[PDB]
Design a protein around this ligand. Structure first.
Ligand SMILES: [Zn+2]
Lengths: 127, 117, 217, 68, 69, 203, 101
RNA sequence: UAGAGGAUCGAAAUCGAUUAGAUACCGUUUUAGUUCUAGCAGUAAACGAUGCCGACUGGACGGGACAGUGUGUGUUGUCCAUGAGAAAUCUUGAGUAUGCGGGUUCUGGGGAUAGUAUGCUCGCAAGAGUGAAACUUGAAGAGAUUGACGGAAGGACACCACA
């Protein structure tokens, strides 16, 4: 989760400069679960990663649609009744944005966690 | 201390631009005109507008003095300078191209007579 | 009596530009304060926010001078701010109103939740800054009011808002910095990409190329 | 409320962007003549002011007007 | 600030709080030690002398006071 | 790549561009360049610039000019003296508006100056020389065309025709070549109909 | 005032000291003002009388080089160095060892 | 503090000047000290007044080491943007949004009393480290602007200045 926060600062830097692609010289397993949840929601075009028997590599394809992404350290523990307070602190409006949690069913955003009756540890957000 | 103020300089440029072709290069002629055109009272002022004009005239009419754009004079000085010279740059044929300029020629395949150095 | 002086001013005289949202769309600089009286005719209110005194020392006497800050907007989506310093107070207020008009901008409005109704509040959160003064706006539920300070209130009413929360930080008793930090907090909520700006549109020509023939003859 | 969208960065363009510009090109008839149509491009002040707004414009013209 | 670090934060923030003067008089229990009437809001006294005091400049005056017990 | 310039053919203009030294740049080059460039020789350490580059961009610059219906609102600017003659010639052959001499700060923004202007497109013969005219375009929503040489800055410029600026011959060569395209692409004119009127353009 | 902080020293702690040539005060060597000059050994208003006095048929008059070193108070007072304006303070002058003669 | 040594300079002391008076600046006679060996002590505008480690980021002209051959890695000086800042200014950071969370420490909480009392630990001492309160008080402070002044520096001038 030190690799998750490093990735979000490098994405904010390129999305502000108008880049199309981003190459990072590292790649972890839960860094790739966070990126697969931005792809199915429409915020990036795609990505791909290389195997080199070093720390890994990853290439992100940006879109033009991202306003910001972040990570929360440390990963607090939130019951299913406390999901909704973390949403009013992190997203600008009530109609868009996604807060992601690491639950006992995988990685879900805050709309799914309410339709499955679970809580977990917070990872990050993006809008 | 023989400097001419702005009201007497600024006036002589208005005269040299409108009634320009009425003026020639002697003091006794240009003074007769400024009595016709301008309306001042002091006889010392016309004497200095007329004396500054005769210096402007043999500058404008012989060599170089820009900063005034005389409409009627921008034809005589232009029709004699646009005389096409005896040689254009489309006459030489032994074009001594260089080496790297040469290999840029054939890769695009240009036409002509390019003699390398 | 208004003999226009620029291209955009000439078209407004000939009724080729009928709204103000035709100029904002292509970012054309407004140079004359009469282009705003005639396109938002007699729905433009004014508010004098502040007046104080400035002093300078020279080799020929101490010059006292008066500064005014003024804001304008109709009540719907436009608002602007201007300021000037002249000798007496009547010519300073009157000169700072011509500058406020030439800086009108649009403001995006939205709903607190859902997608149905007519817009009443701001479209998201935003902040602005001007010399250690910091203003935060937060969208409010319907039938709430405008909870904020006094001089903040006159800016958010002339823009057409009905519900809002604010929190401020820093040195806000510099009333001209406090008024500029809160005009920049509305330019920030209106500058975020929303998911309905995601699909593109067809392109068009600005009004200086559509009406090219009318300009000459 | 509406904002144009930049043609080179997909960023929406504000109304106080007084360095933003609009470019129209002639729809070139075959055999080297003009037929009567144009293609519009919109640019924002940020891209234009940093100095790289030139390397990106001809890249885009190669995809829409001389692509293949 | 890890998730298992709450004893390091209570120890650290209690020590910073003592740098506030108002809090320090209450925490060390010495808020009524040097005080001429202690915890009372008013007090009685018998009058010994009747004096006059100068104002502090830039004010010219003489304010009337009394010495009591 | 080579599809925008292949829709027309540099018919014999390879002579007029090589004879007048319109491909000889300078000693220095920035990482902005090295994409318009071909190579630099070891003899004088001079940089050579591609000829397709100068031909790819002249095709685009001519299409932006023709996009404006009334061509009496395309000011051309040149301060230096080598451009006084070429610029004034490239305004009767086309129909633009010439601005020569020194540029007065406030021409576009001030409405109380000697002469006031309001063009819809701007053409410049040198960036570093006509510094003021580029800088003032960023207050009135104005596109610009330039003749960047080798070391200039490209800020505030949209279309950059990489050519030579120093020599008095190369300056007149560029304005001649572009002059015929604007007549060629508007009316039924000829591209190579004479090579003797390029003497009327030189200073 | 200055980005030097007044002296040409980078990435070292201490830098050695000298004693000023006029008053004799102790100063860092990188902060002192230093000047080099080449003077003729005989004055120029005396060369004619020296061409009739010489016994050799070919004579060259000698020249010596001198390096000087002063403190900030002694160079400012002696007008070896003057007060400059804010922007002109940044101009440095050198020697160019690759000059041809 | 002990031994060795002693060219130069020089606190303290001392005369001679200067001055209204100078126990001072300037000078004369003359010391401890200034050097080496063995130790004690533990302070500095010990300063870039600028914690340590990790991720990411435009140009131009240089230097120093190694390796290659038209370049690379570790370091480093100057100058310009973007960005930041209360500003002066900062450019491997004083940048990466109040759009606020990468890991882990220390220090500050209006001025003055005061780094002073008292207790304790260390030192041959000189002292260092840690460290209050009663009583007092409306400002003390940072950066920049226009004036006024300098027993401040320049450039022009004038028989109420010289030649
Ligand atoms: Zn000295």
């Amino acid at each position: 989760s030190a690799a998750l926060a490093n990735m979000c600062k490098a994405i904010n830097n390129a999305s502000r400069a108008g880049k199309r692609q981003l190459l990072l010289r590292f790649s972890t397993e839960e860094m790739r679960m966070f990126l697969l949840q931005m792809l199915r929601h429409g915020y990036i075009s795609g990505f791909s990663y290389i195997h080199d028997k070093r720390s890994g590599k990853s290439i992100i394809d940006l879109n033009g649609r991202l306003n910001r992404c972040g990570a929360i350290s440390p990963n607090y523990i939130v019951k299913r009744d406390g999901i909704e307070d973390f949403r009013t602190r992190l997203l600008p409006a009530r109609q868009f944005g996604h807060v992601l949690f690491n639950t006992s069913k995988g990685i879900l955003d805050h709309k799914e966690c309410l339709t499955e009756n679970v809580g977990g540890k917070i990872l990050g957000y993006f809008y | 201390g023989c400097v001419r103020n702005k009201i007497v300089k600024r006036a002589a440029r208005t005269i040299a631009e409108k009634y320009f072709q009425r003026l020639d290069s002697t003091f006794d002629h240009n003074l007769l005109v400024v009595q016709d055109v301008a309306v001042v009272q002091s006889k010392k002022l016309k004497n200095e507008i007329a004396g500054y004009l005769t210096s402007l005239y043999k500058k404008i009419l012989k060599g170089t003095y820009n900063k005034v754009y005389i409409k009627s004079h921008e034809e005589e000085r232009e029709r004699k300078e646009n005389v096409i010279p005896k040689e254009s740059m489309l006459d030489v044929d032994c074009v001594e191209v260089d080496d790297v300029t040469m290999e840029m020629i054939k890769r695009y395949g240009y036409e002509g007579n390019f003699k390398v150095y | 009596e208004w003999i226009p002086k620029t291209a955009v001013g000439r078209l407004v005289k000939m009724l080729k530009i009928t709204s103000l949202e035709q100029i904002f769309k292509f970012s054309h600089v407004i140079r004359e304060p009469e282009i705003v009286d005639l396109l938002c005719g007699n729905s433009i209110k004014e508010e004098v926010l502040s007046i104080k005194s400035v002093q300078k020392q020279t080799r020929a006497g101490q010059k006292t001078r008066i500064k005014a800050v003024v804001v304008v907007g109709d009540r719907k989506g436009h608002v602007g701010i201007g300021t000037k310093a002249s000798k007496e107070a009547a010519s300073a207020i009157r000169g700072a109103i011509a500058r406020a008009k030439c800086a009108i901008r649009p403001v995006r409005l939205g709903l607190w939740d859902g997608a149905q109704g007519k817009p009443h509040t701001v479209s998201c959160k935003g902040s602005g800054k001007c010399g250690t003064s910091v203003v935060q706006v937060i969208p409010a539920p319907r039938g709430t009011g405008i909870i904020s300070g006094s001089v903040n209130k006159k800016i958010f009413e002339l823009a057409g808002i009905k519900d809002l929360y604010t929190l401020s930080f820093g040195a806000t008793s510099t009333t001209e910095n406090f008024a500029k930090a809160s005009i920049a907090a509305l330019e920030a909520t209106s500058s975020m990409i929303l998911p309905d700006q995601w699909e593109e549109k067809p392109r068009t020509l600005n009004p200086l190329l559509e009406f090219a023939d009318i300009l000459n003859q | 409320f509406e904002r144009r969208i930049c043609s080179l960065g997909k960023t929406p363009i504000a109304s106080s962007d007084k360095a933003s510009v609009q470019i129209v090109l002639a729809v070139l008839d075959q055999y080297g003549q003009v037929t009567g149509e144009t293609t519009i491009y919109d640019i924002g002040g940020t891209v234009r002011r940093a100095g790289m707004g030139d390397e990106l414009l001809l890249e885009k013209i190669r995809m829409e007007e001389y692509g293949a | 600030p890890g998730l298992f670090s709450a004893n390091n934060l209570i120890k650290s923030r209690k020590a910073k709080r003592l740098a506030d003067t108002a809090y320090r008089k209450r925490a060390l229990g010495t808020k009524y030690k040097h005080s001429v009437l202690g915890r009372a809001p008013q007090a009685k006294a018998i009058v010994l002398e009747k004096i006059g005091v100068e104002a502090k400049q830039p004010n010219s005056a003489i304010r009337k006071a009394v010495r009591c017990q | 790549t080579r599809i925008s310039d292949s829709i027309k053919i540099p018919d014999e203009f390879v002579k007029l561009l090589i004879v007048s030294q319109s491909h000889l740049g300078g000693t220095s080059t920035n990482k902005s360049f090295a994409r318009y460039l071909y190579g630099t020789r070891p003899r004088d350490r001079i940089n050579i610039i591609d000829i397709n580059a100068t031909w790819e961009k002249l095709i685009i610059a001519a299409r932006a000019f023709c996009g404006i219906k009334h061509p009496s609102s395309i000011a051309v600017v040149s301060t230096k003296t080598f451009g006084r003659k070429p610029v004034v010639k490239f305004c009767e052959a086309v129909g633009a508006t010439p601005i020569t001499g020194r540029f007065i700060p406030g021409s576009f923004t001030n409405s109380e100056v000697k002469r006031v202007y309001d063009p819809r497109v701007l053409i410049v013969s040198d960036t570093y020389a006509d510094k003021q005219a580029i800088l003032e375009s960023q207050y009135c929503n104005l596109p610009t065309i330039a003749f960047v040489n080798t070391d200039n800055s490209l800020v505030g410029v949209d279309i950059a025709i990489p050519m030579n600026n120093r020599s008095p011959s190369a300056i007149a060569a560029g304005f001649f070549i572009l002059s015929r395209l604007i007549n060629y692409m508007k009316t039924g004119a000829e591209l190579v109909r004479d090579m003797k009127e390029v003497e009327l353009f030189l200073f | 005032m200055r980005r030097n902080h007044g002296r040409g020293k980078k990435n070292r702690g201490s830098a050695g000291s000298i004693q000023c040539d006029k008053c004799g005060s102790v100063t860092p060597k990188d902060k002192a003002i230093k000047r080099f000059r080449i003077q003729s050994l005989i004055e120029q208003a005396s060369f004619d009388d020296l061409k009739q006095a010489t016994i050799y048929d070919v004579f060259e008059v000698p020249r010596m080089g001198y390096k000087s070193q002063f403190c900030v108070s002694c160079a400012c007072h002696a007008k070896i160095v003057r007060v400059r304006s804010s922007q002109a303070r940044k101009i440095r002058y050198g020697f160019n060892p690759n000059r041809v003669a």
